[PDB]
Amino acid sequence: YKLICYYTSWSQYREGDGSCFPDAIDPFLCTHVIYSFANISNNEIDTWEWNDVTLYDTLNTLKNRNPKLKTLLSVGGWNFGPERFSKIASKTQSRRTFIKSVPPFLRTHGFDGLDLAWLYPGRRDKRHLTALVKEMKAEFAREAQAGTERLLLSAAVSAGKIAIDRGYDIAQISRHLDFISLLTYDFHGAWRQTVGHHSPLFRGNSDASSRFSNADYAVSYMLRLGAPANKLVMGIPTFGRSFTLASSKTDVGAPISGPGIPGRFTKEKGILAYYEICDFLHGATTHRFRDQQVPYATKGNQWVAYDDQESVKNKARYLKNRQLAGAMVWALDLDDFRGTFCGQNLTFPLTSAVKDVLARV
Ligand SMILES: *[C@@H]1O[C@H](CO)[C@@H](O[C@@H]2O[C@H](CO)[C@@H](O[C@H]3O[C@H](CO[C@H]4O[C@H](CO)[C@@H](O)[C@H](O)[C@@H]4O)[C@@H](O)[C@H](O[C@@H]4O[C@H](CO)[C@@H](O)[C@H](O)[C@@H]4O)[C@@H]3O)[C@H](O)[C@H]2NC(C)=O)[C@H](O)[C@H]1NC(C)=O
């Protein structure tokens, strides 16, 4: 089983204990660690943070301790304009230029592969995404002729049915990618004023519309569209989403005035790291949707949808029963990496839990 774990560049800037460098990563925890995110300048892959070259090296030294550990560099991300990707992929001239610049870059910094994070291609992009993947793989296969281990090629893909139909040719790209990560944790919709869980495992025996907004349907749909199970990776969030309540109503369907207040270390409205959530739990009321099998907590006017060891183990078992390639975690720096916030002195509580399930048959 594969355990794909993302590490984010900007987490180094968080104050105090929040700060996280490749350094803190347990080499034997994951099978793959993906660095986020690489950028594109003059149609060529390039670094993002001033010190990426230093962090790249730090990250890849972990391979001295665990010889089997594989690393990948991810291109794109949310702060990377979708249009920018769209523009590079439409012109065969800029696409070939970008493709050619990747292998040497990855080779120089010691990466085993490339992860595509185009978020997201629109209806007019589907064709071009296919060409990018096909050509990128062809270039990787060609470079392997030089007597070196072929670079890996993966992609982070939306888990929303509409988003999938609109910009992805799943049957086509599945045959060229090494693995596919399903972003099964952006299910609730940042668009409207209502309390709801962003990473429901199951549909919910109790609310008709939007049965497509849960991991179970996303996986079933990808398998139906032709993505082989042995290439699908289910994404598991290590963060939580917050909301500020517009009323004293805490139960499902409760009015929302906006995003929850920022966390001490995370400093971003609407989200909280799991270690920030562990501190939040004190004096908070804990609830759990029986149908979706995911928890949520409330304190004052703050409502938080998140994942704990049990909901995460739950998702892992589901992943196994459907015989998928494995799990993907977003992200290592949002889990209790120091292991000093969430009671149990255990390091990476959430990611370890996923690993326990994957290691037992
Ligand atoms: C990820 O990679 C991307 C892609 O390279 C980086 O994005 C782009 O970075 C450039 C440079 O920082 C920004 O473009 C500016 O380009 C010139 C100034 O840059 C040149 O200026 C002169 C030549 O004109 C030269 O001496 C310099 O050495 C340098 O090469 C500006 O003219 C240009 O100014 C205007 O910006 C307006 C926006 O307010 C536009 O309307 C105008 O058309 C005009 O370009 C521009 O500011 C870009 O901002 C940036 N993305 C683009 C091109 O949209 C990116 O920085 C990198 N990310 C990170 C985190 O490093």
Domain boundaries, the chain: 1-238+307-361, 239-306
The rounded distance, in Å, linking the Cα atoms of 216 and 45 is: 35
Asked if residues 304 and 298 have their Cβ atoms less than 8 Å apart, the reply is yes
| Strand ranges in 47-124 using DSSP code E only, listed in sequence order | 70-76, 113-117
Q: Please tell me the distance from the alpha carbon of residue 351 to that of residue 344, in angstroms, as a whole number.
A: 14
Q: Distance, CA 84 to ligand 1 centroid (Å)?
A: 13
Q: What's the gap in Å between 36 CA and the centre of ligand 1?
A: 22
Helix axes 126-143, 92-109, angle to 10 degrees: 40
Cα separation, 97 vs 292, in Å, equals 45
The answer to whether 32 and 358 have CB atoms below 8 angstroms apart is no
Looking from the CA of residue 47, the nearest atom of ligand 1 is 61
Beta pairing partners, 195: none
Residue partners of 224: CB distance under 8 A and separation at least 6: none
CATH number for the segment(s) 239-306: 3.10.50.10
Report CA(83)–ligand 1 centroid distance (Å): 16
Whether residue 325 contacts residue 246, with contact meaning beta carbons closer than 8 Å, is answered with: no
For residues 137 and 134, give the distance between their C-alpha atoms in angstroms, rounded to a whole number.
5
Q: Report how far residue 355's alpha carbon sits from residue 149's, in angstroms, rounded to the nearest whole number.
A: 27
Question: Residue 3: helix, strand or coil by DSSP?
Answer: strand
The Å distance, Cα 9 to ligand 1 centre, comes to 22
Cis peptide before 120 (omega within 30 of 0): yes
Q: CA nearest 335: which of 24, 78, 49? A: 24
- CA-to-CA dists, residue 213 to 116, 187, 216, 306, angstroms: 23, 5, 9, 16
Dihedrals phi, psi of 302, to nearest 5 degrees: -100, 130
**Nearest residue to 130 via CA among 102, 169, 171:** 169
The angle subtended at Cα 58 by Cα 73 and Cα 326, nearest 5°, is 45
Q: Which amino acid is at 91?
A: K
CA geometry: angle 334, 5, 31, nearest 5 deg: 145
Provide the 3-class DSSP secondary structure of residue 287: strand
Ligand 1, residue 49: give the atom nearest the CA: 60
The three-class DSSP label of residue 33 is: strand
Residue 183 β-bridge partners: 158
The answer to whether 349 and 274 are in contact (CB under 8 A) is yes
* Paired tokens of 110: 């010691």
274 in a known ligand binding site: no
Is 270 marked as binding a ligand? no
3-state SS of the chain: helix, strand, coil percent to 5? Answer: 35, 25, 40
Query: How far is it, in rounded angstroms, from Cα 47 to Cα 45?
Result: 7
Testing ligand 1's pocket by substitution, the residue of 13, 39, 48 carrying the most ligand atoms inside 8 A of its CB is 39
Residues in the ligand 1 pocket, defined by CB under 6 Å: 39-42, 48
Give, for 60, the enclosing helix (H) or strand (E).
helix 52-65
- How many CB atoms sit inside 10 A of residue 44's CB? 16
Resolution of the experimental model, in Å, one decimal: 2.3
Q: How far apart are CA 229 and CA 231, in angstroms?
A: 5
**Do the annotations mark residue 322 as ligand-binding?**
no
Element (H, E) at 64: helix 52-65
Experimental method: X-ray
In 3D space, the residue among 201, 196, 210 whose CA is nearest the CA of residue 234 turns out to be 201
31 annotated among ligand-binding-site residues: no
**CATH architecture assignment, domain 1-238+307-361:** Alpha-Beta Barrel (3.20)
Chain center to CA of 241:
14
217 is annotated as contributing to ligand binding: no
Type of residue at 276: E
